[PDB]
Amino acid sequence: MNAIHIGPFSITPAARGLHYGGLPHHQWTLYYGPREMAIKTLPDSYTSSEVRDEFSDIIAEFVIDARHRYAPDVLELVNSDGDAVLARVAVSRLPEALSGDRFPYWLLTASRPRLGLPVTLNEYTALAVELSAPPLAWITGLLPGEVLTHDAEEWRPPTSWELRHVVGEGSFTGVSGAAAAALLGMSATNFRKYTAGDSAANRQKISFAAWHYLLDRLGVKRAS
């Protein structure tokens, strides 16, 4: 009857069980941090991974909701007075020269309010290199800004709960602790001092530079 952890998710059994149809069950609750997500009444004869699996659909649609809810803005390349979209690019930040003929392409916002700027192809290229969003940028939709900021005066190290958004096989990147450690050039043992049940008594937290470098290597947030 031990509680189960899938990255930042938690499935816990209630303190006392119950009989249902003469057999012992327990109600298990799915938690995303403090948010209660789902309740299911499960036979005690269920293994741990039987409990775990019964909730993996509700988790999957959470992810789906988050990939959409936090998807980056998208820019569109069209011919100057052309008629089709020639390319699209997701961008984690908008170009500062956007508003309402020497140039042969327009870079357009894919959503209203429509902002545009005229660009040569080399200009479009430089912009996309600079601004392109990385594959898992939507995970930043779930982390607090104190953790994401490059302002060393306001930066707060992530908690193990926040770290588990991005490392751990049940995390939203799927990338395990041991792989994460190698990215940072540390031992698996040393990196796991940051993500543990007892990590509150581990005085060494992840460094500002390691964390932002990590988020880049995992494809969550460009170091720029």
Author numbering: 1 to 100, 105 to 228
The authors write:
AcrIF24 is a recently identified Acr that inhibits the type I-F CRISPR-Cas system. Interestingly, AcrIF24 was predicted to be a dual-function Acr and Aca. Aca proteins are transcriptional regulators which commonly inhibit the expression of acr genes by forming an acr-aca operon. AcrIF24 is dimeric and binds a short inverted repeat sequence in the acrIF23-acrIF24 operon promoter to repress acr expression.
The purified AcrIF24 protein sample was successfully crystallized and diffracted to 2.5 Å. The crystal belongs to space group P6522 with one molecule present in the asymmetric unit. The final structural model contains the complete AcrIF24 sequence (residues M1 to S228). The overall shape of the AcrIF24 structure resembled a bird and was composed of three distinct domains. The wing domain was formed by five β-sheets (β1–β5) and one long α-helix (α1) at the N-terminal part of AcrIF24, while the body domain was composed of six α-helixes (α3-α8) forming a helical bundle fold at the C-terminus of AcrIF24. Because the electrostatic surface features are sometimes important for predicting the function of a protein, we analyzed the electrostatic surface features of AcrIF24. PPI analysis showed that the complex formation significance score (CSS) of the MolA/Sym1 dimer was 0.2 (the score ranges from 0 to 1 as the relevance of the interface to complex formation increases), while that of the MolA/Sym2 dimer was 0, indicating that the MolA/Sym1 dimer might be the biologically relevant form. However, our intact, fully folded crystal structure of AcrIF24 indicates that AcrIF24 can be in ordered conformation without binding to Cascade.
